[PDB]
Amino acid sequence: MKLAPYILELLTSVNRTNGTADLLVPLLRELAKGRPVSRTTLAGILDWPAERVAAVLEQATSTEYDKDGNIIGYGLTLRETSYVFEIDDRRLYAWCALSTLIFPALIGRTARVSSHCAATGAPVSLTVSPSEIQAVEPAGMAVSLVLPQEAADVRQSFCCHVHFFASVPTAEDWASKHQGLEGLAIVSVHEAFGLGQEFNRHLLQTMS
Numbered sequence: 001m002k003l004a005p006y007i008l009e010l011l012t013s014v015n016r017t018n019g020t021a022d023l024l025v026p027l028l029r030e031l032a033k034g035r036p037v038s039r040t041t042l043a044g045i046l047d048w049p050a051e052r053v054a055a056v057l058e059q060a061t062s063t064e065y066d067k068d069g070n071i072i073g074y075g076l077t078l079r080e081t082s083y084v085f086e087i088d089d090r091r092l093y094a095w096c097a098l099s100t101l102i103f104p105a106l107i108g109r110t111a112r113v114s115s116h117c118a119a120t121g122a123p124v125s126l127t128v129s130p131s132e133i134q135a136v137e138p139a140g141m142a143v144s145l146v147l148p149q150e151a152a153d154v155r156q157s158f159c160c161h162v163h164f165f166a167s168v169p170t171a172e173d174w175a176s177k178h179q180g181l182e183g184l185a186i187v188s189v190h191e192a193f194g195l196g197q198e199f200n201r202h203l204l205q206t207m208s
């Protein structure tokens with residue numbers, strides 16, 4: 001299907017201010033180590049003042065902090081979700097199915113992804129590298145997409161509707177009872193991975 005609207009709105013939804021893309025990739029790489037990330041650590045990596053880091057994060061209202069005020073969640077998170085995202089010996093989580101397909105390229109590591117079908121509860125899993133997916137189980141795994149909203153919190157307007165499913169027919173059956181959602185579509189996990197590659201390619205072309 002035509003994916004340009006999804007790419008555009010996701011980029012827009014993500015791109016709220018300058019420096020967001022330049023902040024996003026190092027933050028993801030830090031979170032991937034499996035521990036909370038301090039703003040000062042980010043500042044050192046970026047060679048930014050801490051106030052600049054704070055300003056960018058302030059506009060990302062979905063951002064999760066722990067009791068120490070350190071960053072524990074931004075697309076990738078230490079707080080449990082339905083989407084398990086493992087790198088090496090560290091179990092992380094992701095906010096949505098598409099997230100798990102996009103992050104490995106941005107952090108430059110292969111991830112073991114697992115979840116459950118949103119319609120049947122069946123376990124689903126796959127291996128996601130920066131360049132390809134492997135070990136897709138079950139092989140016909142599907143993903144639901146909706147059109148991201150620009151101003152809304154990306155987590156509640158997009159992520160909460162973007163799931164894995166055991167198969168395309170199972171997902172389309174589920175989708176028939178989810179009317180009203182703007183841009184709701186069912187794609188194979190392969191088409192969703194391609195969507196993520198296009199997203200990443202555009203996102204990375206905007207970094208400093």
Ligand SMILES: [Br-]
Nearest residue numbers: 002003004005
């Ligand atoms: Br289009």
Ligand SMILES: [Cu+2]
Nearest residue numbers: 095096099159
């Ligand atoms: Cu998401």
